[PDB]
Write a protein that binds this ligand. Structure first.
Ligand SMILES: *[C@@H]1O[C@H](CO)[C@@H](O[C@@H]2O[C@H](CO)[C@@H](O[C@@H]3O[C@H](CO[C@H]4O[C@H](CO)[C@@H](O)[C@H](O)[C@@H]4O)[C@@H](O)[C@H](O[C@H]4O[C@H](CO)[C@@H](O)[C@H](O)[C@@H]4O)[C@@H]3O)[C@H](O)[C@H]2NC(C)=O)[C@H](O)[C@H]1NC(C)=O
Ligand SMILES: *[C@@H]1O[C@H](CO)[C@@H](O[C@@H]2O[C@H](CO)[C@@H](O)[C@H](O)[C@H]2NC(C)=O)[C@H](O)[C@H]1NC(C)=O
Ligand SMILES: *[C@@H]1O[C@H](CO)[C@@H](O[C@@H]2O[C@H](CO)[C@@H](O)[C@H](O)[C@H]2NC(C)=O)[C@H](O)[C@H]1NC(C)=O
Ligand SMILES: *[C@@H]1O[C@H](CO)[C@@H](O[C@@H]2O[C@H](CO)[C@@H](O)[C@H](O)[C@H]2NC(C)=O)[C@H](O)[C@H]1NC(C)=O
Ligand SMILES: *[C@@H]1O[C@H](CO)[C@@H](O[C@@H]2O[C@H](CO)[C@@H](O)[C@H](O)[C@H]2NC(C)=O)[C@H](O)[C@H]1NC(C)=O
Ligand SMILES: *[C@@H]1O[C@H](CO)[C@@H](O)[C@H](O)[C@H]1NC(C)=O
Ligand SMILES: *[C@@H]1O[C@H](CO)[C@@H](O)[C@H](O)[C@H]1NC(C)=O
Ligand SMILES: *[C@@H]1O[C@H](CO)[C@@H](O)[C@H](O)[C@H]1NC(C)=O
Ligand SMILES: *[C@@H]1O[C@H](CO)[C@@H](O)[C@H](O)[C@H]1NC(C)=O
Ligand SMILES: *[C@@H]1O[C@H](CO)[C@@H](O)[C@H](O)[C@H]1NC(C)=O
Ligand SMILES: *[C@@H]1O[C@H](CO)[C@@H](O)[C@H](O)[C@H]1NC(C)=O
Ligand SMILES: *[C@@H]1O[C@H](CO)[C@@H](O)[C@H](O)[C@H]1NC(C)=O
Ligand SMILES: *[C@@H]1O[C@H](CO)[C@@H](O)[C@H](O)[C@H]1NC(C)=O
Ligand SMILES: *[C@@H]1O[C@H](CO)[C@@H](O)[C@H](O)[C@H]1NC(C)=O
Ligand SMILES: *[C@@H]1O[C@H](CO)[C@@H](O)[C@H](O)[C@H]1NC(C)=O
Ligand SMILES: *[C@@H]1O[C@H](CO)[C@@H](O)[C@H](O)[C@H]1NC(C)=O
Ligand SMILES: *[C@@H]1O[C@H](CO)[C@@H](O)[C@H](O)[C@H]1NC(C)=O
Lengths: 443, 124, 119, 443, 121, 445
């Protein structure tokens, strides 16, 4: 009765992994890379009667995100002035004047020899450094902290790294499926799915401990975790309300520069204008307490209402392991959140978090060439929105019904999973067959 | 309707949306080692397009979005009525259901077309 | 005659040189640009071939279609178009009505494809 | 009545920008190495009967590629050459006074410095002669090379030739080159003597400022072309219909010396001179030049009126690259005075010697960045070149006095190639189209 | 037999393997470029053959009769020798100096045929 | 009464060279890193019945990729490694007499210099042992390294393995590889036992001079192949049907020291030697060698006459790269003497022969003037055993018709090493379209 009929242009697809295009809305690094415009605005086709499975922890879009961000970064530093000539013995003293007690020992006044553009001529340099970038050799002799492990390169002062939003676009033959179910927890079937050509804009914001300047959850705190009962996994907490945080490095500065080589310029500090104070960030405690209450009741959904949830500080490690970390106006801040994660939940009033500043940056947890951040003239202040948190369980319980949670942090991929969880990439497969009462006519 | 808007539609309902589905396979007209990555992506799109076109040519369906063949449908693959298949089932569901017979049908279709051309030589 | 040679004559005359024109289409830093150029030529070729397939007459140099000609595009008579105009002039004359036809051709192609299935 | 008929292989086209490739018309030079692709045994030009087409040399894109290609090639060829960072040392210099014609007082200086040998610890005292044009005072005084405060210095490789052998540009598949053969084509607008071709003729990538050497000639009369005739913000290009020869020399007999300054790293220097010191210079017939100007002023009056007076004056000032006639002769770089060529008023041996300067370190392309350095050339240099055209400018600020002074012009290197490229346009071939007919598909 | 298994077989016998041969033609920083160049040229060759069959009106066939007569100046061998004794490798050598001629005979007869058909609708 | 018929999918081809790609089976080995592409299971072959093809191993240009890609990979591997530029300083050296066999004859030197450390203002006195072959006197005497006047020296990365693994070469779509199975094939001419494969078996990229190690053996008999038999300027490639084992040792116990020369830049050096000092050497059974030569001389005579005398001798001279048997054993570079091996006349418990070997650290790899490689010392004692599978020989020529000829070890060209494995393969391009006559005219409706 039935015969095989071949149909081409069949609207079906398979899971697939491909290369994506980066595009943006028309000197930074991002816009000079993601040069493909997102300027036109076609939107999406909702798929009626389509259920599809998503898994944010098994996605590869995040790998492409991670890889390309790092590669872009390296390309941007590639053509900049090297600091090799700076790996010399430094003679340093302490800073005792015009400084508060809390800052004593943080800064050092160093003096050293440097070359000039002529090979047989040298100059003395006087500059001020943070102790985090300088170690003792054993007034005392010091060296820069990374001259024993890797080359140090100065980032170009005219290159902006501002994380403008970027969009990813499918290559022809592929499509991006998007889950818009407000209750989606990161895995499994989603029944409200639309198809798009490009993702919405995502800002490639880099941070530790807290998730800044991302999307908010819709009407609830959503906690997404690959393995809920496994303390080896972190959890991503998405808030439906932002929390405002005001950060600054309040002291005024000077920026000086010298020529070391043939058009090779180096930037450094000199003096602090006014006195010396600690960098810090301000959050109202009222909003912080409200935020935690929302998070805590959400956590209890997996532990029981009667569970006591305690917060505590980081377990230990380097600054990129234990502190909050972000770029504010081009500067690199490390903030102590131990006084933030200090409550226990049992069934303006601001908080100031002290912060440290560091100029030699080991990015991506990749030991290799270090980046040097030249100083910024003036006083830096910025305001950011906290949109989520990275936390961990201690685990190792005795079923006490009480558990302490710690700020997490670690991998950077997680910073993008929080935005990319909604997207899936598939390959279109237009060819297929089906039965029909139609025999080919043979002549 | 729109591209892939027919994905949740029944197989029958979706049979009339094939032109958009086919046209957009070549939509990538308008659009460092980065350039190399994208260059390969373009090459792959071409390679996929061509393997499907060659196969339709092999089966004698080069001029058709929809072609009847002389390979009978085998009820052992899916012993279900035509009415369910076209009016209730969607193409996504259908494809999953017959995903383990693809290697059979391609072989049957290749030889069936070869047989017809060979048989034509007795006319010529 | 010569490739692009017929451009000096009428639309009608040029109909026998279509295979001339159809023949040359497939004729460390630096090589990147050259390889991309080769890719683009292929993409343009394939697009046009796909469109002819979309519009039914995939194998013809010339095909009549089932889309009627509109006087709103051109109301000039054939006795003047085919004999007095060149293809360049013609293309310039109807340059607004391209993107619409491409769509009309699917409409006038797929209906008969359906009315071939019920055999 | 009428139906749409689809045609494929239709002989029509559209203006386009695509990438062209180069070919060499039949042995270490850069041009031959790069344009390794052979040219056709003979291109054919197909005339198009009954056509008119519009060309515009100032809106061309072929020139942009030529510019890009020449810079790319230039740099790629210099990438593997010896870097001369070791020369940026304090120099001890005095004037050369023996056997010097008074016109050459100053100019050369006798410098001495301590150069690094292939071993790091050993140094040599090296003596050499440099032109003052490449050397500045630091303040038997201390001196440095002019570019040690700006950029890297690279020695151009002595084994690499830059002879501007003519290169042909060829269309990629799907594209064609149109050529304008009209005798009077002024660089813009409709052209009726139109033909098509696969490739252009060979164009010699000759580089010069002010006066154009070894280019094409006008076929009937001197023709002057400009983007905007009445706008003094634009230059004018004069294509002569007859060539004028210019004889250029560097009379001093140079002895080349060299030193190994690294592991197979060789530096070449000027050594000393055999015989008396004389200045470089160029010879042009006066009568020939005067006749040439006559031919030019006749064309200029076509735009300005019978009653006008055309005066010529010298350049306005600036870098040697713009104030002098900058060109390569025998591998050496000449910066010749041209005031003697532009000192006359036209109202409605018999030769001139132009003095020339020689400069070794060059900021080619008007780029700020690394500068090439010519190696010294052994012996005495002589060449004879053909003057084929000029770059000129209007004075501007006219009071309608009927007298106008023209000044030597100059400009971007692209303008030197527009001189050939005004004859060409590139288009894309578009084989599909439709037309009406009394023919319905036989459905 | 399998891909190229028919290479030593006679011309007639070899007509039975035309689709294995067809399928295996298509279903395939300095390093990456060498690979891409190979892939691109394979496509270009593929397309030329398809284009040419299209030019001749043979795109829908593995084998097509044409309107161009066979010449004794190319081969004066018996039809039975050609199909029953000879192989395609031998044959290709035998007529290797005429293929470039034949191609344009096919082009013209196809153009005349399409024109004749156009005149009838 | 016949018509032209066009046929597509015709199983024919044209000879052609194209780009080949590599693959390998089955962890910092450079070969594996590059040939990351997997191989498939072995059923990639069809025998071609009724096909005779002409092969020519010396006109086979796939070997050119072997001698291009191998070079490229080598340089790619060294590209990111530590530069030794800062070490080109005046050295002050003396001899060593401590527990040394007399026959070292000053091979090693006790030498020191002022090295620049990671802080630019500091020096470190460094003491180490050097081979005489790496060091040239300037004139505690002053010396410099041999290559500081010619090129940069780069230290090879100690974490990268260079052990050759079999590499398979695979055809791109549209191409196929024709394999000759004729056991008597002499490198050229028609072959009737021809099969087609899409990818070859793997060949280890072993690099050596004079003697060919770890290759394939001939079946049944020794086969001698050359481009022009009576032209004494050609290399003779001898493929043995039995291997000969050779035991190569660098017997002294070693210490490897390292110093930081820059910001994460480490240099490795020799320290001192544990125990007394002995010469490097290789051991070959004399009888096995003598039997091997007997097989070879019979095969040589069949092309020169069977009334001749075959003589073996060492090379005429040149640098170590051509006068010695050059090879990599355990990562170390050996330059072994062969004059006592090639010392014979043939006229119509093991008793092995020990050959002395020299060791070098500064290497002019590929006999290419350009960047030099520095081989860091290897901790411990090295011993390896290799399979001698063939020879490279040349003749003196200059015949006086004395029915006597002298054969000497040849070498230098590396392509010739791979030809010994590649002679069985040819690459062709498929041409599926063609025409033939028929009784059928196109039917026109
Ligand atoms: C989370 O998201 C918020 C925004 O929603 C980000 O906040 C922005 O941060 C950047 C960087 O610190 C701010 O940019 C700076 O603004 C200064 C103030 O602007 C003056 O000038 C403008 C005109 O351009 C006036 O309209 C305005 O009233 C002020 O008078 C500038 O002075 C700064 O200039 C410096 O950088 C530029 C490079 O762009 C150089 O060219 C200058 O010479 C100079 O060095 C700079 O432009 C921005 O204003 C903030 N936006 C808002 C709304 O506050 C957070 O940073 C982000 N958080 C994270 C973690 O990503
Ligand atoms: C720059 O280098 C010079 C040496 O060239 C240092 O000067 C020496 O300092 C020590 C310690 O005070 C004295 O004992 C020496 O006599 C000084 N030598 C000379 C030539 O002056 C100088 O201190 C270094 N300066 C900096 C800022 O590092
Ligand atoms: C999604 O499924 C619904 C049914 O759940 C489809 O609704 C049908 O719509 C047609 C046209 O209006 C009616 O004739 C049918 O009677 C409706 N079905 C039922 C059960 O009432 C809807 O069209 C589907 N969407 C898509 C894109 O196919
Ligand atoms: C290889 O060649 C032999 C002939 O030498 C082929 O054998 C013939 O096969 C046909 C099959 O139709 C028989 O009718 C003939 O009688 C056979 N000839 C003889 C002398 O016995 C063989 O088939 C060829 N094989 C391949 C793969 O081409
Ligand atoms: C080459 O090395 C091998 C070891 O890999 C030697 O083989 C051994 O020889 C001894 C006799 O001296 C036997 O007792 C062992 O059983 C053999 N071992 C193996 C694995 O076969 C071989 O003799 C050496 N050849 C030369 C010339 O030195
Ligand atoms: C400088 O400050 C640090 C931190 O307070 C302290 O450890 C160190 O001893 C101080 N050194 C001097 C100069 O007293
Ligand atoms: C955030 O979630 C809480 C808990 O579901 C809800 O009470 C609150 O109104 C939500 N806030 C917003 C802005 O939607
Ligand atoms: C938590 O709050 C108590 C209030 O008495 C304070 O003593 C303690 O130091 C705080 N802990 C942290 C980490 O800030
Ligand atoms: C149908 O399927 C059965 C096995 O279920 C198999 O034996 C038979 O050969 C198949 N027929 C066709 C035409 O595929
Ligand atoms: C398929 O067959 C069953 C059993 O006869 C029947 O109930 C069902 O309605 C048929 N399917 C459709 C879609 O009609
Ligand atoms: C076309 O129309 C013109 C009037 O503009 C008329 O002169 C000419 O004969 C017409 N051609 C025909 C016969 O269709
Ligand atoms: C070389 O160095 C010495 C330092 O002892 C200095 O006096 C001399 O002037 C230098 N020579 C030159 C030519 O610069
Ligand atoms: C032009 O000539 C005058 C007179 O000799 C001179 O003063 C002026 O500097 C010259 N300008 C240039 C650019 O040569
Ligand atoms: C060092 O050894 C060499 C042999 O390699 C010898 O010629 C030289 O005289 C020896 N020098 C001393 C000081 O023993
Ligand atoms: C380092 O240089 C000094 C120069 O005063 C010399 O005496 C010393 O021996 C050198 N060190 C070495 C290891 O050669
Ligand atoms: C090697 O060749 C010789 C002579 O050709 C023969 O006697 C011997 O048996 C062969 N050995 C093997 C393993 O085939
Ligand atoms: C091969 O060598 C012989 C002897 O050297 C010579 O006569 C001959 O010309 C060479 N070439 C050939 C194969 O003819």
């Amino acid at each position: 009765n039935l015969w095989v009929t071949v149909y081409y242009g069949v609207p079906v697809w398979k899971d697939a992994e491909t290369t994506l295009f980066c595009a943006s809305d028309a000197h930074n690094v991002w816009a000079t890379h993601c040069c493909v415009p997102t300027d036109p605005n076609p939107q999406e086709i909702h798929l009626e009667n389509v259920t599809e499975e998503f898994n944010m922890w098994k996605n590869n879009m995040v790998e492409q995100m991670h890889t390309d961000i790092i590669s872009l970064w390296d390309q941007s530093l590639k053509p900049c002035v090297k600091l090799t000539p700076l790996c010399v013995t430094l003679q340093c003293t302490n800073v005792t004047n015009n400084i508060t007690d809390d800052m004593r020992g943080e800064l050092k006044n160093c003096s050293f020899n440097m070359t000039t553009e002529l090979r047989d001529k040298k100059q003395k340099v006087y500059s001020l450094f943070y102790r985090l970038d300088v170690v003792q050799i054993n007034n005392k002799e010091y060296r820069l902290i990374n001259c024993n492990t890797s080359a140090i390169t100065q980032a170009c002062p005219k290159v902006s790294f501002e994380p403008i939003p970027i969009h990813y676009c499918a290559p022809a033959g592929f499509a991006i499926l998007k889950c818009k179910d407000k209750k989606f927890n990161g895995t499994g079937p989603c029944t409200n799915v639309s198809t798009v050509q490009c993702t919405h804009g995502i800002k490639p914001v880099v941070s530790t401990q807290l998730l800044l300047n991302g999307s908010l959850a819709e009407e609830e705190v959503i906690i997404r975790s690959e393995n809920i009962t496994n303390n080896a996994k972190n959890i991503l907490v998405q808030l439906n309300e932002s929390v405002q945080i005001n950060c600054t490095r309040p002291n005024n500065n000077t920026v000086k520069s010298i020529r070391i080589g043939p058009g090779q310029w180096f930037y450094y500090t000199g003096d602090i204008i006014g006195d010396i104070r600690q960098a810090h960030c301000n959050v109202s405690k009222a909003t912080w307490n409200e935020t935690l209450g929302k998070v805590v009741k959400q956590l209890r959904k997996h532990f029981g209402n009667n569970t006591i949830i305690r917060f505590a500080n980081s377990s230990g490690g380097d600054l990129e392991v234990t502190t909050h970390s972000f770029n504010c106006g081009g500067e690199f801040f490390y903030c102590n959140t131990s006084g933030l994660f200090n409550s226990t939940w049992i069934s303006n009033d601001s908080i100031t978090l002290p912060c440290r500043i560091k100029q030699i940056i080991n990015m991506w947890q990749r030991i290799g060439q270090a980046m040097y951040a030249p100083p910024i003239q003036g006083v830096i202040r910025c305001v950011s929105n906290i949109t989520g948190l990275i936390l961990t369980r201690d685990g190792g319980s005795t079923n006490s019904t009480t558990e302490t949670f710690r700020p997490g942090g670690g991998d950077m991929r997680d910073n993008w999973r929080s935005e990319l969880y909604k997207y899936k990439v598939v390959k279109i497969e237009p060819l297929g067959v089906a039965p029909t009462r139609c025999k080919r006519r043979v002549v």
